[PDB]
Amino acid sequence: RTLLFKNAELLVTMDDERREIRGGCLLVEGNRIVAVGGDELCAAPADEEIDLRGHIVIPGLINTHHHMFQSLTRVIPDAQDGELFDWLNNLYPIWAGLTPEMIRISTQTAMAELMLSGCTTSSDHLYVYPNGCRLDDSIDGAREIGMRFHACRGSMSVGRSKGGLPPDELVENEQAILEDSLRLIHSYHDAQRYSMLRIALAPCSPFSVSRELMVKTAQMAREQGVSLHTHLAENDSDVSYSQTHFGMTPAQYAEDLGWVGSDVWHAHCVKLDRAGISLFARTGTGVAHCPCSNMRLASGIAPIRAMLDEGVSVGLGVDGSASNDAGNMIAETRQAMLLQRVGFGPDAMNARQALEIATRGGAKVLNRDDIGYLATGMAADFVAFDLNTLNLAGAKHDPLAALVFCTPGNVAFSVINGQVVIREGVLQTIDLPSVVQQHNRLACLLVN
Amino acid sequence: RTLLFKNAELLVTMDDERREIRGGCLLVEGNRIVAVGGDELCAAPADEEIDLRGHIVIPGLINTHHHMFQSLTRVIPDAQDGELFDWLNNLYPIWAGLTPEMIRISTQTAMAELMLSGCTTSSDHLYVYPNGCRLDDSIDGAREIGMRFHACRGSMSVGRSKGGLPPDELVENEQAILEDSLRLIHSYHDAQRYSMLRIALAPCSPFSVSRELMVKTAQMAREQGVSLHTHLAENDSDVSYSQTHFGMTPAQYAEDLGWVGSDVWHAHCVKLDRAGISLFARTGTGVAHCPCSNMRLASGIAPIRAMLDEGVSVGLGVDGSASNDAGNMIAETRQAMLLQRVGFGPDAMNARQALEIATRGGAKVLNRDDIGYLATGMAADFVAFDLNTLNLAGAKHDPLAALVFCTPGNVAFSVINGQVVIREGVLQTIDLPSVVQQHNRLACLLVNRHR
Ligand SMILES: [Zn+2]
Ligand SMILES: [Zn+2]
């Protein structure tokens, strides 16, 4: 089954030559791209043909950190302002009322926002399982909306009966965690090229569980070929806690647990030291940059430019909607460029460097070689922005930079795994007005 | 004439009690607000009745710095990255081809972006006048789109062949600057309440003109009762240049020039020191905070929280579209909150403080008491965001914070001076797709100009 995107004003490929093709054309069969180029690919009819004049086509953005259940709890009044301590203490007793239907809908809500703002692959970090919630419920929602999903079995063990902050209803026994995590891997992990569903193992933070679960998790992930994800060094407290309790820097504590390698990626890394950047570069460890979260939570300016210069694989993440509180992937791309410039100078990040993090960087951090750019044999994952909107008026001097320097609206078109999921700005895979409405009634229900 | 906006989910007034009314209602006739309240107001006679169920109403956001002509020259490739020195030198020769029509259309383009993102009053800082352009051309476009406009006669005298970066076609004779400025005040400045047009005088920077032109300009604003605007201390260079040539801080050189007072407002002020903050606080001098520009140009994090604690009047600006490069007022409000928090901590700026900068603070910096919040006798300047979009899904726990912490789309409705200028997300005062087409059609002409 064939799909032809023809005569885009600018087809950004992100391929090995970083081709930016004027009048560029894209030919798809099934889930993969057959060729990127020009009018040469239009001479035969295709089962579907979509004119893309006046549009920029880019590879689909890849979101590499999230907490989609938190899209049910944005701007909770008690949590909008204050210290991360009050943030957790105010939000945990609420999240203790999450029901499996809420995980299933809240996955689609968060996913719809990312998709309409240009994202074709996302991870999630669901690490709470009250009232019979399961990673399966999140997966059911991802399958319905058609997004490429990296589901993380997040976990927590240290609750209030062990000196921790999470209530006891929101922690679990480490043996039950390893057993659910292995059941999830066996039931959902597709390791083949163009997989639409993959599992990674992901304790919430190296301090939310025992060191034994950190090591046992990595052993299991290595045995099964899945990735490892966690929160690492997102603020000053993280650094102090690691030095005070384990006498190590967060990077050193990470290396010590086996949690380095191209099958690992750490979220935030705002306070990664120079030695930790060197370590992550030579072992291939990835970082998920969450610039809006780092600002909205007063975490800091991660040394992203320092990491890229030294060779670190960096992807982009919006983080949970209680710590952003938006899910706008292209705006997060914009934000990474703005925040890097104000922290490190007028040469710290341009439009193409940001967009590369949001595409190739995310694929690398998720340990995937089949997404992130547009070339023969790659997954058919791309979006298209209308260039004649008011938002981009006067910015056609560079359609690629226009997306990062201006604030565009929704994408016009989106193709995930070869399937046209957004047409003229309308989500095709779900009844979006109905899901949004349902989402808001559960959020009202969850909060009261 | 009469208009009723009824049953909003949340009507945030920004009034003296900061009332945030559930089911809030707004009763307008002409340009006034006649009454603010609740269900009681449905007994009131109205010519037209507008249901705002599921919407949040906020007072219209007030933009206090711009360069609307630069919306024809966004993401210019040579200017996307590098030092401000390369930014100026790549963009000056381009802007030297501006025609009066380009000013007339780009003003509408720039204003439309602001209006669809929640802004009802904006100033501008047009400081180039090549090929017979005039501030009149800006004004013609503003009158057509219906936005409340504070038009600044920007000016520049220190150009090339005189030790400056602006080319010689983009400088002007200091006597002609004062003479066209007095013509603009006499012909356009409406000092009456609910004025839709006010003039302010605004040399580009204290160093872009002679000291005489700054003082003569300051005397004229005082003599005519108008305001004064300029860029002050936006970067390290600006501060060092002042210490080097005049042995003073930019705030000191400003006070030394007469350029302080409640009729003055300075853009950026990224490097204002503690004493200059105190100086601005006791003199009532205003600042226009421009967070996106401050980042996209690697200027720095301005100490807005320090200024508010000291009593400084702070408004918000998007700045010219070549140093942002967007014109989204609500996202600029969000951005000001994010950037203050990452610079100074989790208590440096909440949703309500940022929105207050975008409303009352913008009204104060402009020296206006008839806009900026919703109460009996205020101008009918407000917008309404649909709360049931995907962007705000799960954020109805606080509709006001939702506007700052999430990324909403365009407004659903907009009212400036009593005129419903946006209906169900659709701009009413111009043929927007057609103006957008012309805008891109002229920017192409400008960029391929011979230079
Ligand atoms: Zn997170
Ligand atoms: Zn400016």
- DSSP symbols for A343-370: HH-TTS--HHHHHHIIIIIHHHHTT-SS
Interface A–B counts its CB contacts (< 8 A) at 202
* Residue from B327, B248, B57 nearest A389 by CA: B327
Nearest ligand to the C-alpha atom of residue A126: 1
**Residue B433 lies inside a defined structural domain of this protein:** no
Whole-number Å distance between alpha carbons of B93 and B20 = 49
* Residue from A331, A316, A319 nearest A68 by CA: A319
> Helix or strand or coil: residue A192?
coil
| Residue B179 φ/ψ, nearest 5 degrees | -85, -40
Question: Shortest Cα distance from A154 to chain B (angstroms)?
Answer: 22
| Residue B311 φ/ψ, nearest 5 degrees | 105, 15
- Is the domain of B11 the same as that of B110? no
Question: Which of B112, B295, B393 minimises the CB distance to A439?
Answer: B393
Q: Where is the domain boundary, A306, A337, A372?
A: A372
- Is the domain of A379 the same as that of A346? no
- Is the domain of B305 the same as that of B327? yes
For residue B228, what are the β-bridge partners?
A: B201, B264
> Domains in chain A: how many in total?
2
Q: Which residues of A touch B326 (CB under 8 A)?
A: 391, 405-407
**Residue B348 lies inside a defined structural domain of this protein:** yes
Q: Which residues surround ligand 2, an ion (CB under 5 A)?
A: B 319
- Is the domain of A71 the same as that of A23? no
Q: Which residues of B touch A303 (CB under 8 A)?
A: none
- Is the domain of B240 the same as that of B384? no
Cα end-to-end span (Å), chain A = 49
For ligand 1, the distance from its centroid to the CA atom of residue B277, given in whole angstroms, is: 37
Q: How many CB atoms lie within 10 A of CB B262?
A: 14
Q: Which residues of A touch B390 (CB under 8 A)?
A: 109, 112-113, 116, 432, 436
Question: Which of A80, A401, A409 minimises the CB distance to B75?
Answer: A401
For ligand 1, the distance from its centroid to the CA atom of residue A290, given in whole angstroms, is: 9
* Residue from A52, A43, A46, A60 nearest A22 by CA: A52
> Helix or strand or coil: residue A162?
helix
- Is the domain of B224 the same as that of B289? yes
**Residue B449 lies inside a defined structural domain of this protein:** no
Strands B413-416 and B419-423: antiparallel
The amino acid at residue B348 is A
| CB–CB contact A388 B436 (8 Å) | yes
> Helix or strand or coil: residue A434?
helix
* Residue from B438, B430, B450 nearest B106 by CA: B438
Nearest ligand to the C-alpha atom of residue B268: 2
| CB–CB contact B82 A347 (8 Å) | yes
How far is residue A74 CA from its own chain's centroid? 18
**Residue B439 lies inside a defined structural domain of this protein:** no
* Residue from B174, B255, B243, B169 nearest B208 by CA: B174
Question: Shortest Cα distance from B257 to chain A (angstroms)?
Answer: 30
> Helix or strand or coil: residue A109?
helix
CA–CA distance from B190 to each of A73, B147, B200, B369 (Å)?
A: 47, 15, 11, 15
The two three-digit tokens of residue B18, written as one number: 């900061």
Question: Shortest Cα distance from A95 to chain B (angstroms)?
Answer: 13
- Sign of the alpha-carbon torsion through A296, B273, B239, B154: positive
CB A150 within 8 A of CB A198: yes
Burial class (CB in 10 A: 0-12, 13-18, 19+), A163: exposed
- DSSP symbols for A209-242: S-HHHHHHHHHHHHHHT-EEEEEES-SHHHHHHH
Question: Shortest Cα distance from A445 to chain B (angstroms)?
Answer: 11
How far is residue A7 CA from its own chain's centroid? 30
CA–CA distance from A161 to each of A156, A164, A169, A172 (Å)?
A: 13, 7, 11, 12
| CB–CB contact A299 B342 (8 Å) | yes
Whole-number Å distance between alpha carbons of A313 and A281 = 7
Whole-number Å distance between alpha carbons of A344 and A311 = 17
Q: Which residues of A touch B322 (CB under 8 A)?
A: none
Q: Which residues of A touch B339 (CB under 8 A)?
A: 295, 342
For residue A64, what are the β-bridge partners?
A: none
> Helix or strand or coil: residue A2?
strand
Cα end-to-end span (Å), chain B = 52
Whole-number Å distance between alpha carbons of A420 and A3 = 9
Whole-number Å distance between alpha carbons of B108 and B439 = 9
| CB–CB contact B350 A401 (8 Å) | no
DSSP A138: H
Find all residues with CB under 8 Å of A439, minimum gap 6, and list them.
Answer: A71, A72, A105, A106, A108, A109, B393, B394
Nearest ligand to the C-alpha atom of residue B318: 2
- DSSP symbols for A263-278: TEEEEE-TT--HHHHH
Q: How many CB atoms lie within 10 A of CB B191?
A: 11
CA–CA distance from A133 to each of A153, A180, A197, A393 (Å)?
A: 12, 12, 19, 46
- Is the domain of A37 the same as that of A85? no
Question: Shortest Cα distance from A418 to chain B (angstroms)?
Answer: 24
For ligand 2, the distance from its centroid to the CA atom of residue B126, given in whole angstroms, is: 9
**Residue B435 lies inside a defined structural domain of this protein:** no
For ligand 1, the distance from its centroid to the CA atom of residue B328, given in whole angstroms, is: 27
Q: Which residues of A touch B395 (CB under 8 A)?
A: 74-75, 325
Burial letters A106-127, b for 16+ CB under 10 A, else e: bbbbbbbbbbbbbbbbbbbbbb
Strands B55-59 and B3-12: parallel
**Residue A25 lies inside a defined structural domain of this protein:** yes
Nearest ligand to the C-alpha atom of residue B292: 2
CA–CA distance from A338 to each of A156, A347, B110, B290, B324 (Å)?
A: 34, 11, 21, 13, 9
The amino acid at residue B241 is Y
Nearest ligand to the C-alpha atom of residue A204: 1
The C-alpha angle with vertex B438 and arms to B451 and B166, in degrees rounded to 5, equals: 30
* Residue from A180, A176, A112 nearest A152 by CA: A180
- Is the domain of B47 the same as that of B71? no
**Residue B364 lies inside a defined structural domain of this protein:** yes
- Is the domain of A421 the same as that of A280? no
Helix (H) / strand (E) element for A32: namely strand A32-37
The two three-digit tokens of residue A95, written as one number: 């999240």
| CB–CB contact A292 B439 (8 Å) | no
**Residue A79 lies inside a defined structural domain of this protein:** yes
The C-alpha angle with vertex A250 and arms to A248 and A254, in degrees rounded to 5, equals: 95
- Is the domain of A175 the same as that of A303? yes
- Sign of the alpha-carbon torsion through A241, A87, A140, A328: negative
- Please give the residue range of the domain that contains residue B197: 60-372
CA–CA distance from A443 to each of A130, A305, B56, B103 (Å)?
A: 16, 38, 18, 47
The amino acid at residue B315 is G
Q: Where is the domain boundary, B325, B356, B372?
A: B372
* Residue from B333, B401, B57, B10 nearest A75 by CA: B401
Whole-number Å distance between alpha carbons of A366 and A360 = 10
Burial letters A65-100, b for 16+ CB under 10 A, else e: bbbbbbbbbbbbeebbbeebeebebbbbebbbbbbb
Find all residues with CB under 8 Å of A380, minimum gap 6, and list them.
Answer: A3, A28, A30, A31, A32, A33, A415, A416, A417, A418
Crossing angle for the helix pair B211-224 and B174-188, to the nearest 10 degrees: 20
Residue with tokens 């700052």: B404
The C-alpha angle with vertex B270 and arms to B272 and B299, in degrees rounded to 5, equals: 145
The two three-digit tokens of residue B335, written as one number: 């951005």
Crossing angle for the helix pair A432-447 and A100-116, to the nearest 10 degrees: 130
Question: Which of B81, B324, B405 minimises the CB distance to A347?
Answer: B81
Q: Where is the domain boundary, B307, B342, B372?
A: B372
CB A146 within 8 A of CB A417: yes
| CB–CB contact B342 A390 (8 Å) | no
Adjacency order of strands within the sheet including A10-12:
A20-21, A10-12, A55-59, A382-386, A413-416, A419-423, A426-427
Question: Shortest Cα distance from B294 to chain A (angstroms)?
Answer: 7
| CB–CB contact A342 B301 (8 Å) | yes
* Residue from A430, A403, A440 nearest A147 by CA: A430
The C-alpha angle with vertex B74 and arms to B69 and B79, in degrees rounded to 5, equals: 110
Q: Which residues of A touch B82 (CB under 8 A)?
A: 346-347
Whole-number Å distance between alpha carbons of B391 and A200 = 28
Question: Shortest Cα distance from A39 to chain B (angstroms)?
Answer: 25
Find all residues with CB under 8 Å of B251, minimum gap 6, and list them.
Answer: B232, B233, B272, B273, B275, B276, B277, B279, B280
Strands A413-416 and B286-289: unpaired
- Is the domain of B389 the same as that of B269? no
> Helix or strand or coil: residue A281?
helix
Whole-number Å distance between alpha carbons of A351 and B225 = 44
Whole-number Å distance between alpha carbons of B351 and A184 = 40
CB B134 within 8 A of CB B100: yes
Q: Which residues of B touch A298 (CB under 8 A)?
A: 341-342, 344-346, 348
Question: Shortest Cα distance from A72 to chain B (angstroms)?
Answer: 5
Q: Which residues of B touch A393 (CB under 8 A)?
A: 71, 109, 113, 436, 439-440
| CB–CB contact B394 A342 (8 Å) | no
For ligand 2, the distance from its centroid to the CA atom of residue B67, given in whole angstroms, is: 6
| CB–CB contact B296 A80 (8 Å) | no
Question: Shortest Cα distance from B178 to chain A (angstroms)?
Answer: 32
Adjacency order of strands within the sheet including A32-37:
A32-37, A24-29, A2-8, A48-51
| Residue A174 φ/ψ, nearest 5 degrees | -60, -30
Nearest ligand to the C-alpha atom of residue B87: 2
Nearest CA in chain A to B401: A75
How far is residue A401 CA from its own chain's centroid? 21
Q: Which residues surround ligand 1, an ion (CB under 5 A)?
A: A 319
- Is the domain of A195 the same as that of A308? yes
For residue B382, what are the β-bridge partners?
A: B59, B415
